Amino acid sequence: FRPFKSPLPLCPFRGFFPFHKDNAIRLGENKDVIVTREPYVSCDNDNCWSFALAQGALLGTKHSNGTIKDRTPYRSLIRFPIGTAPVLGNYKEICIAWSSSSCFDGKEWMHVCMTGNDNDASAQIIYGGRMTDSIKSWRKDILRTQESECQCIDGTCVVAVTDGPAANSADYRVYWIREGKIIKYENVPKTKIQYLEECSCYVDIDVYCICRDNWKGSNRPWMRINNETILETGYVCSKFHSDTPRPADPSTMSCDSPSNVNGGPGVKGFGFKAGDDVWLGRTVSTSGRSGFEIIKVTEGWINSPNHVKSITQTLVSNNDWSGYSGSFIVKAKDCFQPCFYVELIRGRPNKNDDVSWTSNSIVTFCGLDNEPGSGNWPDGSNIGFMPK
Amino acid sequence: FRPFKSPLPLCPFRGFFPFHKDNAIRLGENKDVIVTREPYVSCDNDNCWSFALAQGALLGTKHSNGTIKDRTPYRSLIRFPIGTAPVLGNYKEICIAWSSSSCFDGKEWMHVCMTGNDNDASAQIIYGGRMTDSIKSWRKDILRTQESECQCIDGTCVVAVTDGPAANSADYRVYWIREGKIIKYENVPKTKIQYLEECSCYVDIDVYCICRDNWKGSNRPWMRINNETILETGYVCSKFHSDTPRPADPSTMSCDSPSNVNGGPGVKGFGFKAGDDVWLGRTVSTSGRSGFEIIKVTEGWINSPNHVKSITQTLVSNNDWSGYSGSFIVKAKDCFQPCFYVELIRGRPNKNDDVSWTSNSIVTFCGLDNEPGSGNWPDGSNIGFMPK
Amino acid sequence: FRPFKSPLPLCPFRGFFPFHKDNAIRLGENKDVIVTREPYVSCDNDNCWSFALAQGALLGTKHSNGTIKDRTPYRSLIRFPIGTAPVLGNYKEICIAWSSSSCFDGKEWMHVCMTGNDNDASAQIIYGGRMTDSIKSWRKDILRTQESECQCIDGTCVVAVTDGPAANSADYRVYWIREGKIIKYENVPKTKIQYLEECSCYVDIDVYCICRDNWKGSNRPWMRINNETILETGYVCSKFHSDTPRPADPSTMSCDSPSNVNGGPGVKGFGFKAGDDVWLGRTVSTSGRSGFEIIKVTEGWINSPNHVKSITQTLVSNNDWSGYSGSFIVKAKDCFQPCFYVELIRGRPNKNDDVSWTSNSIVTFCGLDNEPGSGNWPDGSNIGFMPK
Amino acid sequence: FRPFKSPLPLCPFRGFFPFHKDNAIRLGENKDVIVTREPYVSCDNDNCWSFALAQGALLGTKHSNGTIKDRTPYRSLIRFPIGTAPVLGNYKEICIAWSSSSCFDGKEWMHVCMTGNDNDASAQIIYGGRMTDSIKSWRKDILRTQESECQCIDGTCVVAVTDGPAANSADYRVYWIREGKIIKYENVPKTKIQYLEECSCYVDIDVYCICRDNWKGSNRPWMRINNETILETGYVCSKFHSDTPRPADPSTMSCDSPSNVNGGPGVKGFGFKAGDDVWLGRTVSTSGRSGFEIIKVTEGWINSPNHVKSITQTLVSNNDWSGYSGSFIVKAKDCFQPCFYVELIRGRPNKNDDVSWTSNSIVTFCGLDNEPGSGNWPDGSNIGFMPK
Ligand SMILES: *[C@@H]1O[C@H](CO[C@@H]2O[C@@H](C)[C@@H](O)[C@@H](O)[C@@H]2O)[C@@H](O[C@@H]2O[C@H](CO)[C@@H](O)[C@H](O)[C@H]2NC(C)=O)[C@H](O)[C@H]1NC(C)=O
Ligand SMILES: *[C@@H]1O[C@H](CO[C@@H]2O[C@@H](C)[C@@H](O)[C@@H](O)[C@@H]2O)[C@@H](O[C@@H]2O[C@H](CO)[C@@H](O)[C@H](O)[C@H]2NC(C)=O)[C@H](O)[C@H]1NC(C)=O
Ligand SMILES: *[C@@H]1O[C@H](CO[C@@H]2O[C@@H](C)[C@@H](O)[C@@H](O)[C@@H]2O)[C@@H](O[C@@H]2O[C@H](CO)[C@@H](O)[C@H](O)[C@H]2NC(C)=O)[C@H](O)[C@H]1NC(C)=O
Ligand SMILES: *[C@@H]1O[C@H](CO[C@@H]2O[C@@H](C)[C@@H](O)[C@@H](O)[C@@H]2O)[C@@H](O[C@@H]2O[C@H](CO)[C@@H](O)[C@H](O)[C@H]2NC(C)=O)[C@H](O)[C@H]1NC(C)=O
Ligand SMILES: *[C@@H]1O[C@H](CO[C@@H]2O[C@@H](C)[C@@H](O)[C@@H](O)[C@@H]2O)[C@@H](O[C@@H]2O[C@H](CO)[C@@H](O)[C@H](O)[C@H]2NC(C)=O)[C@H](O)[C@H]1NC(C)=O
Ligand SMILES: *[C@@H]1O[C@H](CO[C@@H]2O[C@@H](C)[C@@H](O)[C@@H](O)[C@@H]2O)[C@@H](O[C@@H]2O[C@H](CO)[C@@H](O)[C@H](O)[C@H]2NC(C)=O)[C@H](O)[C@H]1NC(C)=O
Ligand SMILES: *[C@@H]1O[C@H](CO[C@@H]2O[C@@H](C)[C@@H](O)[C@@H](O)[C@@H]2O)[C@@H](O[C@@H]2O[C@H](CO)[C@@H](O)[C@H](O)[C@H]2NC(C)=O)[C@H](O)[C@H]1NC(C)=O
Ligand SMILES: *[C@@H]1O[C@H](CO[C@@H]2O[C@@H](C)[C@@H](O)[C@@H](O)[C@@H]2O)[C@@H](O[C@@H]2O[C@H](CO)[C@@H](O)[C@H](O)[C@H]2NC(C)=O)[C@H](O)[C@H]1NC(C)=O
Ligand SMILES: [Ca+2]
Ligand SMILES: [Ca+2]
Ligand SMILES: [Ca+2]
Ligand SMILES: [Ca+2]
């Protein structure tokens, strides 16, 4: 018997520390590793797990040629031990999916899995391994979800779902799901947020989601959500923006609207509110998906003339490829510890990755109330050693 | 402590949704995957599992040459995580078998495994991992069983077993087995059913089995069974037939006899009675094992002038190979959810699959009381990429 | 909490039925499988397991060349799921060993593992994964044990151990071990038995062991043992002998001494006393390790003029290689079910197995009180397909 | 519910016996095995486990070229079943690490993982799978730890940590950690010990650590520690030294200071105090990392004119490569059994290992109060068979 996960505050932290790293591309040199992208991490009562969207092919085989393609019927959400490379001998297949989210409610896993035609997709809700509910595409344009962990409070899980065009109009919703049954949904208000995709969420009493505006905002949109409703929305105030591409630091402080510059295409990313301050992950490059750093911006959560980057940890050098990044939480004593993963994409379309496939490895970090050291934890593969 | 599975009704449903897909042939390009055919799915209290008859060889090796052959001593029933490809690092060997059925009674797994010479086979009954009973061939002509899950109610498992020629006379029986001990059997009445093989069964209070007539019927025979006896028998009334080959729609309504057209060879398939209606899986082709669709036929379970195909979901295109299909159930709150798998056969004898082996992948779907979208989930292998 | 295994009688049986088969050599064609020999089977409360002496090399690699050699420091007792091929992704290493025995006492596994120099070996006793005791070679000539499961009654495990020359003098002992601690040993009386090695044991209230005389007896020596002492000894009375080599049927009835013909080298084998009758496994060939059959000899356990082979099941044809065979038991309701495995050796020194390695696969059978069918379950590998 | 491990005495023993051996290099001939070094063993309530620092590459692949390098971001502490080779299908990734220690407190695993830049490393403390605390490099010169198991008494784990130069000044500390939270640390007194690295520890009521002086001592430094503080320190009195390199036997008795001869570079090793006597592991060679033997020195723990080598077991011949060695304990009834592992390094820089990689296999031994036999258990690989 296990209770449902509760609404705990975020633990205090002052830096991020290297946790797990899978070295999946390096370890895939002899064709053992499953091709993936859009990885994330989520934990149950006992263990943290790696999740990713597999491509139904082994890295370096002929079927891996062309895996830059985002949506195929051969993509499945898979789970494998955290920090391990995904191989046929260690993975589990969760569901057929080209977009997904997963979260553990304290008793069972819930997953949200989208698959099917772009104009007629459906999301399958899996709870305790059983398919319990579904969502039908209502805008017939790539029904899609977080690509990282959802969050559950007192038995009700909250997940962000989008249907509609990129870089233009589109519907953005939150769904509330309890024991695998959809309870209700809300259309996200568009008073502030103009575009929202690929939300990265965590719990700090309430659920906070920091997402991707792929049209007009180089600043990230966000929502605060509880077990019943959407409480607040906005864009991250920080004049130091954290999407990619983005303007050079320092840029504009826009708490209530997109920056209206360098809006697309964006990249999935995350952040953590801490009092009036905010921590934001971002690529080191302002233009491309290279490097990864996390910054703390003093008073960055609020409207203030005092935004300053008080801390910058460079975790993946700008000479190394990155990709999506997302938040996850780990229960501590009476608080949730903030953690994140970084997707390290290798292959197409990265300049000079002369192989025909596209895949990734993973690195992860967790927050502690201690001072960090420094290092660099990139994918580490020599692309010239790899089967093409 | 777990109770025996009970006689629950089928859940309401109005469409089928993509669940798990293993992409086993694609993932087998580098010779990691075990050669199989006749797969199925069955679930215990905690997990659903893939089962299949392995061929005692890895795909693309020299020993895989000629695996079109149905019965050898090197075939074993194996189990592997649902939606995963079967590899040496993840499989379990259940028993030596070239025909099988498995079901979980709420406490333990039962398996029925036939092996040996065509004219002197025996079925081994395995219960909780121990060999507990057996059936000796009494007609000395390929003693054989469902190739999908059996069903257990209140501790008594029911399984269909056949001994005798194809496309001609033969004995068809149901066996009742409790904690691995055979309690009784009955010869299936031949008042209506003329041929019965490869039953696909599920629970809707009672056990319903929809099977394969490989001689005179393009319509499928069926039985309703409880923990003690056979309650009813017939052929599916639907004027839209669901075996392969079969006449073009619309055909004859034959509730009580084979259609007497396009009788053989047939293919293993399934259906679900829903009130007076029936859902039937079938190949898209009326002649060959290509494509897969499921249809709902209004009043298709009964004698009626009003049969109409109210819903048709095309799940595997007619340009893609299919194969056997079968039902399985998953316990929900107070009902059983109807699900099915489709075997996607690649290799011999499929036209233009120029390899020497025969194997399959798996895709699965479950029923929900929601409207589905649309898509296509075929095997997906480029046969020209495969080791021959 | 689990009780110690009790002294139950053997279940009634009238035939043997195919259980698990690993097809390990066939599945090893692509170099995935660990080289082994001297396999056996033993079960705990929940599962049966395969055990074997690995050679510290993968089949078909350069390190597999020369693995006909019996004793090296690179041999370990390994365990893997019953009926699966042993691969790096599924095995467990139990202990360093070039001779072993294992048994489960109802609570924990005990293993006996010999390794080291031929003239200074030691046996390590492992209990619940901990090394708890040891036996030092006292004759300095290949201290060695059963190569199949030992037996435990009411917490005391019994295992046969030999030290000394082949085809000549030597010490034969039984050891009693409780929770991994050696309690006592006895030198086996030489009033009847003249040579004893590689005992195959089972429980029928008491422990019965049927062993290998490698010097003067083509008939098999046997012992009856309880939790304190050796109760009786003899040679199997049956005038149909069951070692290899052996005289043609019918031969001499020798209840109390070796046959004094075709004495060596012998092969590990087994049998089951059933009332006054006996079941004996044997190679089909009277000269070599080819084929496998089991016979029932009426009144074969006793001195009688009425010995007749009432049943003969041929399980591996004489055209196929066999090897060691041994008994194991599986708890049923209030009796122990008799089962056995057969080692199917491929490679050196088998005529026309033109490879440089030596390894095996496994097939297993269990007894039921039903009539069997017939079949053939040999290794099944085409040696010409194998890496040499 | 499990209690914390208690302060038990060491069991009596008079010799060491072969336990588990992985044969990892032999089994890695076909590129299945993960490249490692700095292995060790540690046990929980149920099982013993192998741990090692992986190099994020498979043995014999192009990424394995150059793995002699000690510290990279691609190194992770991994865990795999004891005596098995580490492969993608069986390993778990514990944390990112180029130096580590692990121990089980009776309830959960704790790990200490150092990674990052040489001049700015941090140690992450993992407890029950969660990152709970950290240590920041305070001397900015390769913050580092035991490379073998730490020890926990009554819930408080003790681990030795070093920061600073080799063969010169440096800080050496002990940290006390409880449920993953750092409680306190102490700088090790330098009244006797002048250099301390890579401590091998065990429990004999208190924690005893025997370590490596890499500057001035061919004799090994040691500490005795309890759940609150450092109790005593010294160098092992034995006039037979046990580091590598070292003077030939017999050398100087130095209980309170380094020998001041053959001081560096040293090698990680271990020993066990037994009354006034001491057991010491050492390479057979006095100059290089070849062979392995363990000696008992009568009165070797104390200042005495009577030091004599009463027992010498040669476990790996001087013709075979060895490497690091370390202690671990296994709970027996009311005492802890002393055990050890030996790292068997193959590849660079070993003379005539003409491959581009560096890796290891493992062999292990445990102490019993019985007389041992003799044997040789080296790595066993033919380096000429290996992919380079
Ligand atoms: C939603 O959860 C509340 C409990 O959580 C509190 O209120 C939330 C809206 C949010 O602010 C959390 O951080 C708070 O901790 C549930 O409220 C309980 O309802 C039951 C039944 O009415 C009642 O017996 C309890 O007193 C309430 N508990 C508390 C602490 O107020 C509420 O039912 C949840 N709603 C849904 C739709 O599940
Ligand atoms: C990656 O694949 C491309 C494309 O392969 C072709 O189209 C695929 C959909 C499939 O049908 C393949 O069988 C086809 O070959 C490869 O580019 C092709 O290379 C072949 C052989 O050299 C050549 O005949 C074609 O003209 C090429 N087609 C195109 C459009 O460029 C490419 O070589 C593959 N990359 C690697 C590293 O193998
Ligand atoms: C078969 O099962 C019944 C219980 O199931 C009911 O009857 C079946 C035939 C079928 O119609 C199900 O859908 C029904 O739910 C067992 O009947 C029980 O028998 C015991 C012992 O006699 C008696 O104490 C109970 O009252 C009965 N329970 C009910 C609900 O009637 C019957 O024993 C089973 N038969 C066998 C051979 O196992
Ligand atoms: C698949 O196998 C066939 C048949 O192989 C032959 O018969 C088998 C039972 C076994 O004994 C094999 O060793 C035999 O070679 C292969 O067809 C044969 O190919 C060989 C080599 O080219 C040729 O000498 C024979 O004449 C062929 N035999 C026949 C009856 O056609 C076939 O090539 C294999 N397919 C693949 C893709 O390897
Ligand atoms: C050996 O086991 C007996 C119990 O088993 C019975 O006697 C054996 C020798 C054998 O014949 C079995 O088949 C029988 O079932 C133990 O006897 C018990 O001893 C305890 C302690 O003295 C006593 O309280 C019980 O009454 C005895 N039980 C029975 C059924 O007689 C005996 O202790 C065992 N000996 C050893 C050395 O472990
Ligand atoms: C199996 O091995 C033999 C022997 O290999 C030689 O001795 C071993 C102990 C080891 O030192 C190897 O490196 C040696 O090569 C092989 O027979 C040898 O083959 C080589 C190469 O053709 C030849 O130079 C030697 O003269 C042969 N030695 C002997 C004694 O015959 C044999 O070829 C191997 N078998 C296979 C299938 O590879
Ligand atoms: C450290 O452990 C002691 C108990 O262990 C004893 O003392 C150690 C220093 C060491 O010598 C061991 O070998 C001994 O077995 C803890 O002492 C207990 O403290 C509690 C709370 O004050 C008290 O109720 C008990 O009486 C003490 N138990 C004993 C046996 O004396 C002590 O608390 C531990 N200290 C820390 C910092 O955790
Ligand atoms: C092991 O690696 C060395 C070095 O490889 C070179 O440097 C690496 C960092 C990486 O950049 C590689 O791609 C480089 O090739 C190999 O030595 C090189 O061999 C190549 C090919 O023969 C040659 O062109 C270079 O001159 C060599 N470089 C040096 C410094 O020697 C070496 O061959 C590898 N060993 C094995 C067994 O493959
Ligand atoms: Ca943007
Ligand atoms: Ca038909
Ligand atoms: Ca003999
Ligand atoms: Ca030194």
Can you describe what's shown?
4 copies of one chain form a homotetramer. Chain A has no helices and 24 strands. With 388 residues, the first copy, chain A, is mostly beta strands. Chain A has one domain: Neuraminidase, CATH 2.120.10.10. In chain A, the strands form 6 sheets. In chain A, strands 1-24-23-22 form a 4-stranded antiparallel beta sheet, with no helix packed on it. Chain A has a 4-stranded antiparallel beta sheet with strand order 2-3-4-5, with no helix packed on it. In chain A, strand 7 and strand 8 form a beta hairpin. The radius of gyration of chain A is 19 Å and the shape is globular. The N and C termini of chain A lie far apart (49 Å). Chains A and B meet through strand 3, strand 5 and strand 9 of A and strand 1 and strand 24 of B. The complex binds a molecule of 3 linked components (NAG-NAG-FUC) (8 copies) and calcium ion (4 copies). The site of a molecule of 3 linked components (NAG-NAG-FUC) has 7 residues of chain D, from loops. Chains A, B, C, D: Its EC number is 3.2.1.18. Chains A, B, C, D: It is found in: Host membrane; Virion membrane; Host apical cell membrane.
In short:
Chain A has 388 residues and is mostly beta strands. Chain A is built from no helices and 24 strands.
Give the tags.
homotetramer; globular; binds a molecule of 3 linked components (NAG-NAG-FUC); Neuraminidase; binds calcium ion; mainly beta; 0% helix
